[PDB]
């Protein structure tokens, strides 16, 4: 009688992929890990606090209004379906508002009812303490994995509203890479330099397909399932060193990862894959502005009159911090060049994590 929230999951994931595209574009060929689901989870929560042109810009970017019937229920069910079978993966969302602000009568009751979460109230005029509170919330709600948020340096005595999203991922594989097969090998960076990096190897039947962009750039695509069938990592790797990674990045979508999943066939392959541990903290302001959400960051343009009548109120700071770890726990795919990965929840198509590994 109920089907997975794949509609919402796709809508949320595609918005998050577009945010990633903005982050990846502006990055100077450097490592970037990110959570499309996470930035969407947070912005959707923010939708409940905004009104007017601020809300307009957000729903127009995301492609849905949280006002509509069951969008929240879907999202809450989505989250808990996501975290159901899960120290392998931990995530947190948090909105911190100035304690002094008069909040609109029925907001918190509504916000908790929808999302089973609370808007945190802290005094930013006590700068050190507000910084402490946020960093503590993040560290403790990611099982210690995300300990600091350097972006909280931009907090000061005029900060009134701050949003935060943090995720850690370190998943065990369904088929482990043998410890013995781990070896050092040159990895060819995009700027032409090589580094010796440790690399895992495994011969096995992997879900695979070739993918070539409309302009002709050619990629190997491989599915690595996690020890729970629930999640999969997709590796998209340039067929040869010379093929640039950004051609694929600038046309990714959630729909597209699903098509790959649809085409893939299980074929015998030697996979050689670098061990890596990547951490990224993104200031989400510029990325979100590039997608049309400008009023939320501006003191007297922003409309937060579903959270408070008092102004000036705008988003002083919006940060995502993501840490991902990947280790062992006839035809060859040797990933000794930059590549893109995507961690996907298969029952909904939710793109949990996405990144470019420019240097392991």
């Amino acid at each position, epitope marked *: 009688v109920h089907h997975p929230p794949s509609y919402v999951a796709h809508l949320a994931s595609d918005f998050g992929v577009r945010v990633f595209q903005q982050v990846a574009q502006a990055s100077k060929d450097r490592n970037v890990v990110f959570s499309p689901y996470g930035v969407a989870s947070v912005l959707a929560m923010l939708q409940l606090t905004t009104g007017g042109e601020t809300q307009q810009q957000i729903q127009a970017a995301m492609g849905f209004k949280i006002d509509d019937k069951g969008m929240a229920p879907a999202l809450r069910h989505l989250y808990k379906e996501l975290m159901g079978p899960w120290d392998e993966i931990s995530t947190t969302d948090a909105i911190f508002v100035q304690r002094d602000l008069k909040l609109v009568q029925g907001f918190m009751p509504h916000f908790f009812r929808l999302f089973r979460s609370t808007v945190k109230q802290v005094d930013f005029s006590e700068v050190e303490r507000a910084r402490f509170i946020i960093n503590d919330w993040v560290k403790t709600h990611t099982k210690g994995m995300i300990s600091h948020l350097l972006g909280t340096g931009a907090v000061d005595q005029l900060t009134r509203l701050v949003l935060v999203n943090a995720l850690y991922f370190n998943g065990q594989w369904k088929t482990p890479f043998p410890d013995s097969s781990t070896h050092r090998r040159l990895f060819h960076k995009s700027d032409g330099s090589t580094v010796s990096v440790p690399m895992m190897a495994q011969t096995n039947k992997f879900n695979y*397909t070739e993918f070539t962009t*409309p*302009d*002709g750039h*050619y990629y190997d695509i491989l599915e690595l399932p996690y020890h729970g069938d629930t999640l999969s990592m997709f590796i998209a790797a340039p067929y040869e060193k*010379e093929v640039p990674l950004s051609a694929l990045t600038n046309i990714l979508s959630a729909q*597209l990862i699903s098509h*790959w999943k649809g085409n893939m066939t299980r074929l015998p392959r030697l996979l050689v894959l670098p061990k890596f541990s990547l951490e990224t903290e993104v200031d989400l302001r510029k990325p979100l502005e590039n997608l049309g959400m400008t009023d939320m960051f501006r003191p007297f343009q922003a409309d937060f009159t579903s959270l408070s009548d008092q102004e000036p109120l705008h988003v002083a700071l919006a940060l995502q911090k993501v840490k991902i770890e990947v280790n062992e726990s006839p035809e060859e795919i040797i990933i000794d060049r930059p590549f893109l990965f995507v961690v996907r929840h298969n029952p909904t198509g939710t793109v949990l994590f996405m990144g470019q590994v420019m240097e392991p």
Partner: nanobody
Amino acid sequence: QVQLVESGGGLVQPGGRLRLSCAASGFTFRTYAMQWYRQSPGTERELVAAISNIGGVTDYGDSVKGRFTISRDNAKTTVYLEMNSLKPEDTATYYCSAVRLPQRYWGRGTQVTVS
């Protein structure tokens, strides 16, 4: 061995439609992006439409978006270009290209005339 043969071009009244096709052979079609270009005397060759190997990711030149649709079938090793609401401006030789960098192949062209 490698062959790209376009067909379907001809004369059509303004506001009309045409479907071009391009039969291909001798390479791994299903791993190539397929593209349509157009060219007349005096005016530079230009991209008309492009399509990924799978997933139907498409790209269109600005002149033709919302009128022309590219599609493909990998089992038939054929690519198509439906043209609608044709205009005199669309008069040109349309050429099919397959591309999997650094490899690119070209067809022989088919004439489309709208007057």
